[PDB]
């Protein structure tokens, strides 16, 4: 809403922290890669240090 | 095997589509060993550069 570009649209998808490296990578490949998404924001997982 | 024989000999993952998120995987442990090798081979000397 704050950008004046008319040919640019922004969409947000919820990618939860899957409690497995295989599950996380597989979920990312099946959803983020198949969505042709641009850029991803990284957040800390449930574990305080991992 | 002189360091982690149990982790070296036993693979961490047994299922192709189900791999546990092990902190020290057998392949992960062997990655350091592969990155930390330097000896003399048949064609010359073999070493590890860039850990890969």
Curated annotation (Swiss-Prot), chain A:
Post-translational events: NMDA is probably regulated by C-terminal phosphorylation of an isoform of NR1 by PKC. Its phosphorylated state is influenced by the formation of the NMDAR-PPP2CB complex and the NMDAR channel activity.
Tissue: Detected throughout the brain, in brain cortex, cerebellum, thalamus and olfactory bulb.
Localization annotation: Cell membrane; Postsynaptic cell membrane; Synaptic cell membrane; Postsynaptic density membrane
Glycosylation sites: 11
Function: Component of N-methyl-D-aspartate (NMDA) receptors (NMDARs) that function as heterotetrameric, ligand-gated cation channels with high calcium permeability and voltage-dependent block by Mg(2+). NMDARs participate in synaptic plasticity for learning and memory formation by contributing to the long-term potentiation (LTP). Channel activation requires binding of the neurotransmitter L-glutamate to the GluN2 subunit, glycine or D-serine binding to the GluN1 subunit, plus membrane depolarization to eliminate channel inhibition by Mg(2+).
Domain notes: A hydrophobic region that gives rise to the prediction of a transmembrane span does not cross the membrane, but is part of a discontinuously helical region that dips into the membrane and is probably part of the pore and of the selectivity filter. The extracellular N-terminal domain (ATD) is a site of allosteric regulation to modulate overall receptor function.
Subunit (UniProt): Heterotetramer; the NMDAR subunits are modular and harbor tiered domains that function in concert to regulate opening and closing of the cation-selective ion channel pore. Forms heterotetrameric channels composed of two GluN1/zeta subunits (GRIN1), and two identical GluN2/epsilon subunits (GRIN2A, GRIN2B, GRIN2C or GRIN2D) or GluN3 subunits (GRIN3A or GRIN3B) (in vitro). Can also form heterotetrameric channels that contain at least two GluN1 subunits and at least two different GluN2 subunits (or a combination of one GluN2 and one GluN3 subunits) (in vitro).
Family, per entry: Belongs to the glutamate-gated ion channel (TC 1.A.10.1) family. NR1/GRIN1 subfamily.
Name by which UniProt lists this protein: Glutamate receptor ionotropic, NMDA 1
The species this protein was found in: Rattus norvegicus (Rat)
Part of the full-length chain shown: 51 to 100 of 938
From Swiss-Prot, chain B:
Cellular location(s): Cell membrane; Postsynaptic cell membrane; Postsynaptic density
Glycan attachment residues as annotated in the record: 23, 36
Record PTM text: N-glycosylated.
Primary role: Component of a non-conventional N-methyl-D-aspartate (NMDA) receptors (NMDARs) that function as heterotetrameric, ligand-gated cation channels with low calcium permeability and low voltage-dependent block by Mg(2+). During the development of neural circuits, participates in the synaptic refinement period, restricting spine maturation and growth. Forms glutamatergic receptor complexes with GluN1 and GluN2 subunits which are activated by glycine binding to the GluN1 and GluN3 subunits and L-glutamate binding to GluN2 subunits.
Quaternary structure note: Heterotetramer. Forms heterotetrameric channels composed of two GluN1/zeta subunits (GRIN1), and two identical GluN3 subunits (GRIN3A or GRIN3B) (in vitro). Can also form heterotetrameric channels that contain at least two GluN1 subunits and at least a combination of one GluN2 and one GluN3 subunits (in vitro). Does not form functional homomeric channels. Found in a complex with GRIN1, GRIN2A or GRIN2B and PPP2CB. Probably interacts with PPP2CB. No complex with PPP2CB is detected when NMDARs are stimulated by NMDA.
Recorded family membership: Belongs to the glutamate-gated ion channel (TC 1.A.10.1) family. NR3A/GRIN3A subfamily.
Protein name: Glutamate receptor ionotropic, NMDA 3A
GN (gene name): GRIN3A
Shown segment, full-protein numbering: 404 to 455 of 1115
């Amino acid at each position: 809403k704050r950008h004046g570009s008319w040919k640019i649209q922004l969409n947000a998808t919820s990618v939860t922290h899957k409690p497995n490296a295989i599950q996380m990578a597989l979920s990312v490949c099946e959803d983020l890669i198949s969505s042709q998404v641009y850029a991803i924001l990284v957040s800390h997982p449930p574990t305080p240090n991992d | 095997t002189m360091i982690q024989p149990e982790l070296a000999l036993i693979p961490s993952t047994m299922n192709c589509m189900e791999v546990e998120t092990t902190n020290l995987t057998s392949g992960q442990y062997l990655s350091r060993f592969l990155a930390n090798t330097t000896f003399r081979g048949l064609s010359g000397s073999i070493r590890v550069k860039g850990s890969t």
